[PDB]
Structure 1
Amino acid sequence: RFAGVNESGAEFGSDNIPGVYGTDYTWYNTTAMGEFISQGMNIFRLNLLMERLVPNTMTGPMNADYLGNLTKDVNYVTDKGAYAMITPHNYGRYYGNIINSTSDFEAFWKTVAGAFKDNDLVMFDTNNQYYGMAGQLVADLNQAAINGIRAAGATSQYVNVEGNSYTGAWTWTTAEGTDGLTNAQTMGNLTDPEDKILYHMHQYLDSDGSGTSSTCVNSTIGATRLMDATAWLKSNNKIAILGQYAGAVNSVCEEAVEGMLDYIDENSDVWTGAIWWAAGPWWGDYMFSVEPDNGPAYSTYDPIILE
């Protein structure tokens, strides 16, 4: 049901907060996004920075200029019938410190979700790639995000919940948090009064699953890396989405990507779709970029994403 791209740029220059628009970060190219929608993609994951959207304190007001831009780009996507996922690209951290106030995190999500409560083509993504924290805390932070989003009256939207350890699909049942707990051990019991939780997992294809290398391990590394997570999803009657994945321009990465997408299809009772990492107007010759006018990966993987 979901096939699309990440939009990355509004979280750029994370070293400069708030940073300057047009120098440190940018918002997304709606012309490109419209082309993607015309070709048939129906989801765009819009990445942003917590500290730019709500400066200083998570319980604070929203910056008007940053929120309007977020809203402009969101409306463009949803006005044309595609889903817009709102993703604070913060790794579970605020101003560089692990978010450990669930009360504060809930307040932040009530604030944000309030701004989009009536848009049923919006999705909320609680935080991009929690890492290096207690497994229990990561679960509690997802739950606090759900609480805040629903408390704001946003009841039609799916909430993407992300695991610890960069929410990696291949390590769902193995990677351990600072408390010794895995994602499989802590993420299952999340509850939602609207029962629209989407488990949100990421999967890269190089040795360490980081996406640093342009070398994919082998032609089947993708599908085989989703198997453990797939079993867990079925076992616990959950559904999921692959929020980030990519491979470089070579024949082994291409096959591995095609195979992993084929697998999501054969297991589409638990997998709902996949979102490429990534699009955006400031990527230059980034090896994973599918931005249309200059993304080096566009010509190869645009057709594959369309299936």
Structure 2
Amino acid sequence: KRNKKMRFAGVNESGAEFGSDNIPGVYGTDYTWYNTTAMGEFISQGMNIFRLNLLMERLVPNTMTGPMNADYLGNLTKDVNYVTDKGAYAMITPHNYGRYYGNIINSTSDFEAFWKTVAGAFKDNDLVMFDTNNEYYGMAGQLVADLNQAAINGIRAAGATSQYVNVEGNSYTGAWTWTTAEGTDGLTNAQTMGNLTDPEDKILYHMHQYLDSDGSGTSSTCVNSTIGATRLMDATAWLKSNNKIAILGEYAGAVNSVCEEAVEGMLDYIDENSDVWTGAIWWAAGPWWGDYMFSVEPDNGPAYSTYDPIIL
């Protein structure tokens, strides 16, 4: 019900980043790519954005300054092209939590090199979005901002000038903790991330929101009937104040009455405040979820029949 009131409505595709113990890992054992048929169904239903998750170390092995692995990049491009050739947006998401081979990415120059490399492969695709990194955590707030800034600079330096760059905060880029959670340097996302600059002026602030008590997305129990919209409120104020726009890049509820009402209430809030929220992206689709309580993968997603119409 809630899509044509949003610039971007769609689903995460999760699976190509799985099994991160094993890098490079092996297709079919540790990770997989996406089901173009299922993505095609979502597109023909009216969804227009897919957040394609991947692992940095598989796309660019050894060092962040190295060349790409052509087979992994090949499959990324195949899934991206299926989506963008049909007019939907493909967001490229390194699902790495600010960490490269386990270690916090401390070098902004390594990060800019990585992003200049990945962006060069897609610089002429106007339907591609770049997502600097999924859910920075346990780091200094200033380094996370500086890493995000290094990514924008890398992306534009490669000549990828038409694409929106999704910048993510520290502390799992949670919306509800945007003004409160502090990094190891004592600074919040509100305190560090407003400074980000882009010569092409296409920065989308990329936040996540879950509805259980600790916001982990771990429990099928949603706090209460309005916990979704209420947790967006502080971040919405912040966005209007500093004249920024955002997208809710991850969200989900379980299949129960309270989670359902809380999810639609949140998506209603986003429509009410579409001056700063450009849309929302469900977590998650992808073929290797089985009975995962948030899986909206059409053929076996337990959340699909319930929340696919809500998104739509």
> What is aligned with 2:100?
94
Shift of 1:269: 0.2
* 1:133-156 per-position Cα deviation (integer Å, ceiling 9, x unaligned): 000000000000000000000000
* Structure 1: distance between partners of 2:110 and 2:297: 36
Residue 61 (structure 1) shift: 0.6
For 2:19 and 2:144, locate their aligned partners in 1 and report how far apart those are by CA, in whole Å: 25
Partner of residue 173 from structure 2, selected from 163, 167, 178: 167
Q: Distance in 2 between matches of 1:151 and 1:273?
A: 27
Please show how residues 6-17 of structure 1 align to structure 2 within 5 Å.
Answer: 6-17=12-23
Give the structure 1 partner of residue 307 of structure 2. Answer: 301
> How far did residue 16 of structure 1 move?
0.6
Question: What SS does structure 1 have at the residue aligned with 2:152?
Answer: helix
SS at match of 1:72: helix
Q: CA deviation at 1:68?
A: 0.2
In 1: Cα distance, 2:42 partner to 2:114 partner: 31
1:272 alignment partner, one of 262, 272, 278? 278
Return the offset for 1:237: 0.1
1:26 CA displacement:
0.2
State the partner residue of 1:49.
55
1:122 CA drift (Å): 0.1
The 2-side partners of 1:305 and 1:151 are apart by 36
Q: Indicate the SS of the match to 1:226.
A: helix
What's the offset of the Cα at 1:263? Answer: 0.1
Please report how far the alpha carbon of residue 44 of structure 1 lies from its aligned counterpart in structure 2 after TM superposition.
0.1
Q: After TM superposition, what 4+ stretches of structure 1 lie above 6 angstroms from structure 2?
A: none
Displacement, 1:62?
0.2
Structure 1 residues 183-223: Cα deviation after superposition (integer angstroms, max 9, x where no partner):
00000010000000000000000000000000000010000
Q: Considering only aligned residues, what root-mean-square deviation do their CA atoms show, in Å?
A: 0.3
3-state SS, counterpart of residue 116 of structure 1: coil
Q: Secondary structure at the match of 1:84?
A: strand
Rounded to whole Å, the distance in 2 between the matches of 1:239 and 1:82 is 20
Identical amino acids, percent of aligned pairs: 99
**Matched residues in 2 for 1:139 and 1:167: separation?**
12
Provide structure 1 residue ranges, at least 5 long, that are not aligned to the other structure: none
Query: In the alignment, what sits opposite 1:58?
Result: 64
Query: 2:10 matched to which residue of 1?
Result: 4
Q: CA deviation at 1:119?
A: 0.1
> With structure 2 as the length reference, what TM-score do the two structures score?
0.98
Please name the residue that 2:246 is paired with: 240
SS in 1 for 2:250: strand
C-alpha distance in structure 2 between counterparts of 1:232 and 1:261, whole Å? 18
* Cα distance in structure 1, aligned partners of 2:162 and 2:82: 19
Pairwise CA distance, 1:305: 0.5
Distance 2:169 2:191 in 1: 11
Q: Unmatched 5+ residue regions in structure 2?
A: 1-6
Tell me the CA shift for residue 251 of structure 1. 0.3
| Cα displacement (A) at 1:116 | 0.1
Residue 240 of structure 1 and its aligned partner are, at CA, apart by 0.2
